[PDB]
Curated annotation (Swiss-Prot), chain A:
Lineage: Eukaryota, Metazoa, Chordata, Craniata, Vertebrata
Compartments where located: Cytoplasm; Nucleus
Any one Gene Ontology molecular-function term assigned to this protein's record: lipopolysaccharide binding
Keywords of this entry: Acetylation, Cytoplasm, Disease variant, Host-virus interaction, Nucleus, Phosphoprotein, Proteasome
Provenance organism: Homo sapiens
Family: Belongs to the peptidase T1B family.
Domain of life: Eukaryota
Segment of the intact protein contained: 46 to 260 of 264
Biological role stated in the UniProt entry: Non-catalytic component of the 20S core proteasome complex involved in the proteolytic degradation of most intracellular proteins. This complex plays numerous essential roles within the cell by associating with different regulatory particles. Associated with two 19S regulatory particles, forms the 26S proteasome and thus participates in the ATP-dependent degradation of ubiquitinated proteins.
The protein, known as: Proteasome subunit beta type-4
Broad class of the protein's primary localization: cytoplasm
Induction section of the entry: Up-regulated in fibrolamellar carcinomas.
From Swiss-Prot, chain D:
Quaternary structure note: The 26S proteasome consists of a 20S proteasome core and two 19S regulatory subunits. The 20S proteasome core is a barrel-shaped complex made of 28 subunits that are arranged in four stacked rings. The two outer rings are each formed by seven alpha subunits, and the two inner rings are formed by seven beta subunits. The proteolytic activity is exerted by three beta-subunits PSMB5, PSMB6 and PSMB7. PSMA5 interacts directly with the PSMG1-PSMG2 heterodimer which promotes 20S proteasome assembly.
Tissue expression notes: Expressed in fetal brain (at protein level).
Function per UniProt: Component of the 20S core proteasome complex involved in the proteolytic degradation of most intracellular proteins. This complex plays numerous essential roles within the cell by associating with different regulatory particles. Associated with two 19S regulatory particles, forms the 26S proteasome and thus participates in the ATP-dependent degradation of ubiquitinated proteins.
Protein name: Proteasome subunit alpha type-5
Family listed: Belongs to the peptidase T1A family.
Signal peptide (residue range): none
Residue window of the full protein shown: 82 to 161 of 241
Cell location: Cytoplasm; Nucleus
Induction, per UniProt: Up-regulated in colon cancer cell lines. Up-regulated in fetal Down syndrome (DS) brain (at protein level). May be the target of the transcriptional activator NFE2L2.
Origin: domain of life: Eukaryota
Source organism of the structure: Homo sapiens
Cystine pairs: none
UniProtKB/Swiss-Prot annotation, chain E:
Location of this chain's protein in the cell: Cytoplasm; Nucleus
Main subcellular location of this protein, as a coarse class: cytoplasm
Family that this chain belongs to: Belongs to the peptidase T1B family.
GO biological process, one term: proteasome-mediated ubiquitin-dependent protein catabolic process
Modified residues annotated as N6-acetyllysine in this record: K76
Keywords in alphabetical order: Acetylation, Cytoplasm, Host-virus interaction, Nucleus, Proteasome
Name of the featured protein: Proteasome subunit beta type-3
Domain of life: Eukaryota
A Pfam family annotated for this UniProt entry: Proteasome
From Swiss-Prot, chain H:
Protein name (database record): Proteasome subunit beta type-6
Subunit comment: The 26S proteasome consists of a 20S proteasome core and two 19S regulatory subunits. The 20S proteasome core is a barrel-shaped complex made of 28 subunits that are arranged in four stacked rings. The two outer rings are each formed by seven alpha subunits, and the two inner rings are formed by seven beta subunits. The proteolytic activity is exerted by three beta-subunits PSMB5, PSMB6 and PSMB7.
Section of the entire sequence shown: 35 to 236 of 239
Any one Gene Ontology molecular-function term assigned to this protein's record: threonine-type endopeptidase activity
One of the record's GO cellular component terms: cytoplasm
Record has Transcription regulation as a keyword: no
Organism classification: Eukaryota, Metazoa, Chordata, Craniata, Vertebrata
Organism: Homo sapiens (Human)
């Protein structure tokens, strides 16, 4: 995808004790138009891993199909092994770098979140194939807006509970809804735990428009 | 439209010794004006006797590290011995020149102990020309770091000053100081320093804090 | 000898014995199929034999639909039959894609037969040991009946049979066309069933036979239900 | 002598390739393995046309001083 | 344009039981003439001729390739090519390179092998055949020579009148363009003979 | 006679046996014996090496594919070297792509596919080498054997090569204790097992023994002639 | 007679004998049976234990070729594993292109055509495996298919493959599978396998079972060990 | 162009204008952008006419072969998936926006939207083409769950009329189709039949 | 170029101009822009002339093979599909705008094919530089179920309107009438314009032109 066509913005993620949470708005924008408003930009790769994407939705769907077939075939051979979130992250880094080297880029930037072997994982992958692991992640304009708040709370408190992490991602989603045009009110939250992956349905942010009357 | 590169920042440093080598780097990853992460060390342990530091486009750094690790394994399987630092250097030169026409945007420094037991540092341009150097700084803050290394370590432009072989303690002090200065006056470099020192015992990793932006 | 055992080599009498053996492979199955044409309809009948009770009777069939308005009956190796059926379906769809109209029955038969020719001329592969009989309605020519054989011969027919009782069946049909008065749909189906039942001595029940028809009124190939087959069978016994 | 010349050519080019890539001298064992890999190709596992179908009808004695000192390696038509 | 790089002019005309084909002689690189003896009309038969104007290199190349094809045709089929068939062959040759075209504008002139009915045609860069009953022109000076032909030409001309007309037209046309000139050669094809004359022209 | 049906892998026999594959399976018997056995925390490979002459060094019977996998060979060294190269490249590819050690079960599955392709096609022979694959992964210690026939097995213990039935019966009668053994006890058991295969005159030595150990904390290591002396000294004597 | 040497050849009486020789391959195999009932399909295999050394849960003859379908094989295990890889590739390609789980009839047809390719050409032998495929989908229902080495494919209410096919088939015939449910069918499959097993010729066997059906929500899976033990105890009791 | 589909219980209603343009010249004012991919699967074609026609014929070919070999009516999701694979693999060289709608027994009436770039979404109503921009508001306000077939037909007609009057690329006659278990009922609205809305009329 | 076609009650009428322009000089007059694809299918062409000629010839040959094999007259839809698939494969680089007209077992079919592989079945179509004027005439005066003479008059009027109004077109008018029963290909149906009389004779007398050299080579007539 040399040119992005239908895109979504700002997948956020933060790792809490015993899991990771990621959240994403449900809008795919056709260049300043809210064309698609119920698309899901978070996927369940396996029980131990989640993935969410910002950028071209078509590339996300292609990656969904490929990675899902990969997960399926390991389940079929069924030797008790499974892909770690680190493994999925590494493969995704390789694939995006290869498509970059071919100058046929997959435009998406993705967050891989998983909890396996008692250790949380949260990793970034860019369209150029830049990849890293970090406590909290934000894509799109999330990097400029939400990531300061996440970093402040995480720097002062290295370890966070699931409840406060959820409140934090909700607050950051509120900020992004305020100050990003491509964003949408409805968003999903999904959390990997020891139990597994559960993606909550359309969730919405209470918004404060008090400063309007101040004028 | 699509640009296959972005400068993810960081600086790398390597300083050799009579019986040691040091390789040190920032741990910040920065795209544009934003900080991707504050813990991403640029130093990687290739062998017991060798460390590589890479700075530039992070995707190229990652793929080159994977390639070097794989080819190290392949050399071990074929020849029943570990690659020397010079061998890794020549192999890296060839690997970098393989893509002369769509290059790896990385500045690489190889630091290690040679077969004789002395410290050796090999420094690479993005396209694989390589030279053995007593010390070198790579990356965004090369311009800032390398002059002070030239003055203190090389005793250049100093008159009536005795020449002493560098020691491990003095080297580590100098590395910490130069990285502090680069943290002050280079936007890209900061928030930690990982010092990887290689001796006959092996790699030893020390981390020291640098100022957050 | 050695003049057999390879399709390429010619006999000293120039006969290519291998394809003639492929013709025997059809009779090795022990089943017969009959096709007879009518003024406004064409029908195909063939024996349906279920060796085991456990077999699902629905799955076993020698009648296949190449396209909406063409149907075939295959006699010979089941696997080669299915492969040729797939190739026929591909040829029909590709014809529609390239030329914008449904493939004629004659051209489908010609394509399949010339493929069988490339098989009987190249060394490594073997002729498919199966025989095809295609039935469809062409607007210009009315009903049509055609047959491919392993050699590449694709001639059209008023009526035909294939399988072990082919000679007996064509002897029976030859008499019936000679006393030509007509064939409506019911008489067409009755002629087919009487031919098959007489040559085999079976005195069929509805399960033992599977019939497929095309008609100018309803051009689509349809495989009649057991109830329809029994309706035709009872009419035969009554008269 | 002919297939010997072929294997000697393989040995020489592999030594120089090693020098080019790693700026070092091959061990006698590694050179013997390099030629042995070529000898193994009579099996025709590879799809390349330019590999002799017959095994190499020659035995070689590789003698050289390496990091391990003087070493003498034997090679046979099998490639062992 | 690239066609104007070398420069040229080629003409053919149809009389009564005769054809004439005429072309300039200059070969020059954008402005500097090199030789006044360039061959732009080539024989493709006993009484069939081809005339190439455009790039000198493509002129020579298509002439050679066409002679290759034609010689194989004549040997295989044991007869002389008809003019229309040569036209079709040249069109196929040019259209084979529809992308990256040979930069030429051929003209065919000849008499039928048996009828001796005269035939003239022209082809474009990419092999578009045009058959005419009066005249055909190609080269840098197509405009000038078109007007001159449209005026001078008359139907059912004698061979001598055809020579006079084609000579006057080529001379007056190539006088009014920079890159063609330096003499002109006229080939007259009749059933019984070929007459080739080099006219006297301004060497400027 | 039945000299026919033995010429090539692509010819089935009248009783459903591909004789060339069996003739390839005979190849493993030719080689010097090998034994592999595992405990809850470790997997071991032990081998009997052979020498062309007194002056010649003993051949290499244990090869390391990766840190977590290593192999021991019985049968053709050529096929062993080729398959080892394939396995090494597969493991390197897995580490490059997914940054995880390749599962040993998946690796032997890949070996099985690659080995199976020769048997069915005309051309390349079956790989006439039998390998014992031993490795530690997240699931645990594992030992597999691969035949010249592409079929592979998972084993508590196994022995391949000449006179390996003696080692197999020793292993079977002593198998129950293996699971809870220390690595020293386990290597000693395997050494006695291969000692069963040796001729009565011959005895275990530092020279002709090679030992390969991998475990949770131990990467695959081949203990060579000098290094096997700690493990060998414990063994008492021939019975 | 050189007619039987190759599959390209025909016998003078119209028989391709290499394929029949390959069909004789599966009869060497230990038996395997699959029974289809209203809820779903149950598979069972008599996996002979050649040696105590071999690990349990090894030499598996029951494969999962997709999440919703399972495969049981008899004949050459190498060819069977390769055919399973082919079937998995076909199912994955179907999902990737057409966007949904492959119908079992179509999957059987494609793998059967792949098998039938080999009987034609001289360069390559027929496969030495006969295998059963089974799936349950709420739309299609319970489906059981068997593919011979020839590439013939058919749907069976009950099916058997391997050495004891005929005896297993009569025992299956006296069952009335259509009315029955899977949790009983596992017990009867165990009974049939224990019956057909020959203790004298075959030293011992470990019953390997699987099913697919609504009880799995349409996923083929290995039997839970409690249910395996219950069925095996029932089979031993009925054997007398 | 304006293409619009809406799902009613048990089927779909498809709708499209007839105008195709080259620049400002209406090359064909009577074009039919609603094509049968299969007996009960249709595609509404928007974008480059050549691209859409080629991809439509290819998907028709593939779905027919798939349907005959499976011996079952094809699925609308299957047709949409084929469209997605083609459009995504050739997204750089292709300029097409497709709405795939139809009826299948498994999942009833379905509407799928393939915008440019090759992604598939199922939507209760979908609009595409240049003129869909102008009627996003009308469909958002007007749409109500559980509309009848006739109600959906009127809704599609009104929306397409609004887009046609406000878009130059859109125009002509309104072509409407209703696909269900019973079959396809195709109709064309022309002249006075096309819904008309008042003008400001100062 | 103006090419145009209409469907009348029992067939088709096709029309085109007879002018070929290279740049802004009339390279040719009496050019034929109505081509033979089959006995029952003829096609007008516009755009790049070589592309039109060669693609029409290729499809003519392919349909000759198809008709020979099938033993029945070729259908118009087959020609349309062949043309459009080739043009789509070439992505408009081959430049041809075609009016495809023929009668077959189904009936009279008129198709309009653009360079990029688009096709449109219509009652009346126009292509080329004069398409707009010809379409103006057609939009004004076309009616359904016209007689053959009425359709010929309409197509002649449209091509004439294209001739006079548009610069690129202009020469004699050609018509072609395809019916189920017969074909009438009408090279010049009308000659709307003619060259004026040359008032002054400029015929050069013998000796007007000098000759530096001459060589007469006799041909062995035999």
């Amino acid at each position: 995808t040399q040119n992005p066509m239908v895109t979504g913005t700002s997948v956020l993620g933060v790792k809490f004790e015993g899991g990771v949470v990621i959240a994403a708005d449900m809008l795919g924008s056709y260049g300043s138009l809210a064309r698609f408003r119920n698309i899901s930009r978070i996927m369940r790769v396996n029980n131990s891993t989640m993935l969410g994407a910002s950028g071209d939705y078509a590339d996300f769907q292609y990656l969904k199909q490929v990675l899902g077939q990969m997960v399926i075939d390991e389940e079929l051979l069924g030797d008790g092994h499974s892909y770690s979130p680190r493994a999925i992250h590494s493969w995704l880094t390789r694939a995006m770098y290869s498509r970059r080297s071919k100058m046929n880029p997959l435009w998406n930037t993705m967050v891989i979140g998983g909890y396996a072997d008692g250790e949380s994982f949260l990793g970034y992958v860019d369209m150029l194939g830049v990849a890293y692991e970090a406590p909290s992640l934000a894509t799109g304009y999330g990097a400029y807006l939400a990531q300061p708040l996440l970093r402040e709370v995480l720097e002062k408190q290295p370890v966070l509970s699931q409840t406060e992490a959820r409140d934090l991602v909700e607050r950051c989603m509120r900020v992004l809804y305020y100050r990003d045009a491509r964003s949408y009110n409805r968003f999903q939250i999904a959390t990997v735990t020891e139990k597994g992956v559960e993606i909550e349905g359309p969730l919405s942010t209470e918004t404060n428009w008090d400063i309007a009357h101040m004028i | 439209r699509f640009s296959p590169y972005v400068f993810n920042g960081g600086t790398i440093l390597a300083i050799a010794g009579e019986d040691f080598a040091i390789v040190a780097s920032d741990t910040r990853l920065s795209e544009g004006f934003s900080i991707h992460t504050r813990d991403s060390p640029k130093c990687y342990k290739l062998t017991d006797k060798t460390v590589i530091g890479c700075s530039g486009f992070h995707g190229d750094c990652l793929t080159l590290t994977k390639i070097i690790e794989a080819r190290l394994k392949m050399y071990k399987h074929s020849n029943n011995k570990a690659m020397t630092t010079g061998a890794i250097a020549a192999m890296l030169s060839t690997i970098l020149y393989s893509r002369r026409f769509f290059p790896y945007y990385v500045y690489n420094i190889i630091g290690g102990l040679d077969e004789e037991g002395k410290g050796a540092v090999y420094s690479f341009d993005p396209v694989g020309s390589y030279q053995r150097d007593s010390f070198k700084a790579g990356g965004s803050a090369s311009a800032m770091l390398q002059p002070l290394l030239d003055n203190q370590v090389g005793f250049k432009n100093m008159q009536n000053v005795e020449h002493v072989p560098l020691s491990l303690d003095r080297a580590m002090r100098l590395v910490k100081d130069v990285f502090i200065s680069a943290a002050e006056r280079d936007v890209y470099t900061g928030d930690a320093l990982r010092i990887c020192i290689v001796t006959k015992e092996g790699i030893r990793e020390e981390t020291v804090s640098l100022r957050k932006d | 000898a050695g003049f057999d055992r390879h399709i390429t080599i010619f006999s000293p009498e120039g006969r290519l014995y291998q394809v003639e053996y492929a013709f025997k492979a059809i009779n090795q199955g022990g089943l017969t199929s009959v096709a007879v044409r009518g003024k406004d309809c064409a029908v195909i009948v063939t024996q349906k034999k279920v060796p085991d009770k456990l077999l699902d009777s629905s799955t076993v069939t020698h009648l296949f639909k190449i396209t909406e308005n063409i149907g075939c009956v295959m006699t010979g190796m089941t696997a080669d039959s299915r492969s040729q059926v797939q190739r026929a379906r591909y040829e029909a769809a590709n014809w529609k894609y390239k030329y914008g109209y449904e493939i004629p029955v004659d051209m489908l038969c010609k394509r399949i037969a010339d493929i069988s020719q490339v098989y009987t001329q190249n060394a490594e592969m073997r002729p498919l040991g199966c025989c095809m009989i295609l039935i469809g309605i062409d607007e210009e020519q009315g009903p049509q009946v055609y047959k491919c054989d392993p050699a590449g011969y694709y001639c059209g027919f008023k009526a035909t049979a294939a399988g072990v009782k082919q000679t007996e069946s064509t002897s029976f049909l030859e008499k019936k066309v000679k006393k030509k008065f007509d064939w409506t749909f019911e008489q067409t189906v009755e002629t087919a069933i009487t031919c098959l039942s007489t040559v085999l001595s079976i005195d069929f029940k509805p399960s033992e036979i599977e019939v497929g028809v095309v008609t100018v009124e309803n051009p689509k190939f349809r495989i009649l239900t057991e109830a329809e087959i029994d309706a035709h069978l009872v009419a035969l016994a009554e008269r | 002598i002919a297939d010997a010349k072929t294997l000697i050519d393989k040995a020489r080019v592999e030594t120089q390739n090693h020098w080019f890539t790693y700026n070092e001298t091959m061990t006698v064992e590694s050179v013997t393995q390099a030629v042995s890999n070529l000898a193994l190709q009579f099996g025709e596992e590879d799809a390349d046309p330019g590999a002799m179908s017959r095994p190499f009808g020659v035995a070689l004695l590789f003698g050289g001083v390496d990091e391990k000192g003087p070493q003498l390696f034997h090679m046979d038509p099998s490639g062992t | 344009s690239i066609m104007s790089y070398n420069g040229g002019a080629v003409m053919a005309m149809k009389g009564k039981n005769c054809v004439a084909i005429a072309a300039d002689r200059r070969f020059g690189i954008q402005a500097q003439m090199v030789t006044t003896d360039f061959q732009k009309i080539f024989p493709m038969g006993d009484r069939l001729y081809i005339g190439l104007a455009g790039l000198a290199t493509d002129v020579q190349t298509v002439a050679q390739r066409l002679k290759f094809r034609l010689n194989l045709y004549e040997l295989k089929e044991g007869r002389q090519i008809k003019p229309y068939t040569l036209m079709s062959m040249v069109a196929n040759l040019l259209y084979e390179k529809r992308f990256g075209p040979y930069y030429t504008e051929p003209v065919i002139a000849g008499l039928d092998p048996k009828t001796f009915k005269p035939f003239i045609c022209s082809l474009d860069l990419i092999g578009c055949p045009m058959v005419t009953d009066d005249f055909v022109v190609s080269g840098t000076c197509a405009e000038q020579m078109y007007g001159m032909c449209e005026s001078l030409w008359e139907p059912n001309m004698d061979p001598d009148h055809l020579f006079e007309t084609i000579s006057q037209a080529m001379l007056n046309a190539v006088d009014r363009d920079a890159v063609s000139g330096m003499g002109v050669i006229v080939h007259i094809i009749e059933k019984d003979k070929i007459t080739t004359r080099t006219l006297k022209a301004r060497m400027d | 006679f039945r000299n026919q049906y033995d010429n090539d892998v692509t010819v089935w026999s009248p009783q459903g046996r591909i004789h060339q594959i069996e003739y390839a399976m005979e190849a493993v018997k030719q080689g010097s014996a090998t034994v592999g056995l595992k405990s809850k925390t470790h997997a071991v490979l032990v081998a009997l090496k052979r020498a062309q002459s007194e002056l010649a060094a003993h051949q290499k019977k244990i090869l390391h594919v990766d840190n977590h996998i290593g192999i021991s060979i019985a049968g053709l060294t050529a096929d062993a070297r080729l398959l080892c190269n394939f396995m090494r490249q597969e493991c390197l590819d897995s580490r490059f792509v997914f940054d995880r050690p390749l599962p040993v079960s998946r690796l032997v599955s890949l070996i099985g596919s690659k080995t199976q392709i020769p048997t069915q096609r005309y051309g390349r022979r079956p790989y006439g080498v039998g390998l014992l694959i031993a490795g530690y992964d997240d699931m645990g210690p594992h030992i597999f054997q691969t035949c010249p026939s592409a079929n592979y097995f998972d084993c508590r213990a196994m022995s391949i090569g000449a006179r390996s039935q003696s080692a197999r019966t020793y292993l079977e009668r002593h198998m129950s204790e293996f699971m809870e053994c220390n690595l020293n006890e386990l290597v000693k058991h395997g050494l006695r097992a291969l000692r069963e295969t040796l001729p009565a005159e011959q005895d275990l030595t530092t020279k002709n023994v090679s030992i390969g150990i991998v475990g949770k904390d131990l990467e695959f290591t081949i203990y060579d002639d000098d290094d096997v002396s700690p493990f060998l000294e414990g063994l008492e004597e021939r019975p | 007679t050189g007619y039987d040497l190759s599959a390209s050849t025909f016998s003078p009486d119209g028989r391709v004998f290499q394929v029949e020789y390959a069909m004789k391959a599966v009869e060497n195999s230990s038996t395997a049976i699959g029974i289809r009932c209203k809820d779903g399909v149950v598979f069972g295999v008599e996996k002979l234990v050649l040696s105590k050394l071999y690990e349990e849960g090894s030499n598996k003859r029951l494969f999962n070729v997709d999440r919703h379908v399972g495969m049981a094989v008899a004949g050459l295990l190498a060819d069977a594993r390769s055919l399973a890889d082919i079937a998995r590739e076909e199912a994955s390609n179907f999902r990737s292109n057409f966007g949904y789980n492959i119908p079992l009839k179509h999957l059987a047809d494609r793998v059967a055509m792949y098998v039938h390719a080999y009987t034609l050409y001289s360069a390559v032998r027929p496969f030495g495996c006969s295998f059963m495929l089974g799936s349950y989908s709420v739309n299609d229902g319970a489906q059981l298919y068997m593919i011979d080495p020839s590439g013939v494919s058919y749907g069976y209410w009950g099916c058997a493959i391997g050495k004891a096919r005929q005896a297993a088939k009569t025992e299956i015939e006296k069952l009335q599978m259509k009315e029955m449910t899977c949790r009983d069918i596992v017990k009867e499959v165990a009974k049939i396998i224990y019956i057909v097993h020959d203790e004298v010729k075959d030293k011992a066997f470990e019953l390997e079972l699987s099913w697919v059906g609504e009880l799995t929500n349409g996923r083929h899976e290995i039997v839970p060990k409690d249910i395996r033990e219950e069925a095996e105890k029932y089979a031993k009791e009925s054997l007398k | 162009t304006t293409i619009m589909a809406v799902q009613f219980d048990g089927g779909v209603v498809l709708g499209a204008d007839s105008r195709t343009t080259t620049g400002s010249y209406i090359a064909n004012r009577v074009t039919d952008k609603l094509t049968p991919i299969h007996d009960r699967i249709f595609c509404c074609r928007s974008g480059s006419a050549a691209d859409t026609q080629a991809v439509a014929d290819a998907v028709t070919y593939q779905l027919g072969f798939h349907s005959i070999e499976l011996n079952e009516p094809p699925l609308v999701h299957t047709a949409a998936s084929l469209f997605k694979e083609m459009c995504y693999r050739y997204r750089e060289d292709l300029m097409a926006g497709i709405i795939i709608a139809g009826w299948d027994p498994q999942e009833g009436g379905q509407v799928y939207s393939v915008p440019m770039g090759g992604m598939m979404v199922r939507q209760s109503f979908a609009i595409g083409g240049s003129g869909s921009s102008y009627i996003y508001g009308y469909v958002d306000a007007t749409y109500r769950e559980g509309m009848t077939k006739e109600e959906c037909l009127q809704f599609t007609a009104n929306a397409l009329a609004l887009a046609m009057e406000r878009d130059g690329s859109s125009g002509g006659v309104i072509r409407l189709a209703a696909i269900a278990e019973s079959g396809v009922e195709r109709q064309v609205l022309l002249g006075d039949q096309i819904p008309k809305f008042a003008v400001a009329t100062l | 170029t103006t090419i145009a076609g209409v469907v009348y009650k029992d067939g088709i009428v096709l029309g085109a101009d007879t002018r070929a322009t290279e740049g802004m000089v009339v390279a040719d007059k009496n050019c034929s822009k109505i081509h033979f694809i089959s006995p029952n299918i003829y096609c007008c062409g516009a755009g790049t002339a070589a592309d039109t000629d060669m693609t029409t010839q290729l499809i003519s040959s392919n349909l000759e093979l198809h008709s020979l094999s099938t033993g029945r007259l070729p259908r118009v839809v087959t020609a349309n599909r062949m043309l459009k698939q080739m043009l789509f494969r070439y992505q408009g680089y081959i430049g041809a705008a075609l009016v495809l007209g023929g009668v077959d077992v189904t009936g009279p079919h008129l198709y309009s094919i653009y360079p990029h592989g688009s096709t449109d079945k219509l009652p009346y179509v126009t292509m080329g530089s004069g398409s707009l004027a010809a379409m103006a005439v057609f939009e004004d005066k076309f009616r359904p179920d016209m007689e053959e003479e009425e359709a010929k008059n309409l197509v002649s009027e449209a091509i004439a309107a294209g001739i006079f109004n548009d610069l690129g077109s202009g020469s004699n008018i050609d018509l072609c009438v395809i019916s189920k029963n017969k074909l009438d290909f009408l090279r010049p149906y009308t000659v709307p314009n003619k060259k004026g009389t040359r008032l002054g004779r400029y015929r050069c007398e013998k000796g007007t032109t000098a000759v530096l050299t001459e060589k007469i080579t006799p041909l062995e007539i035999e």
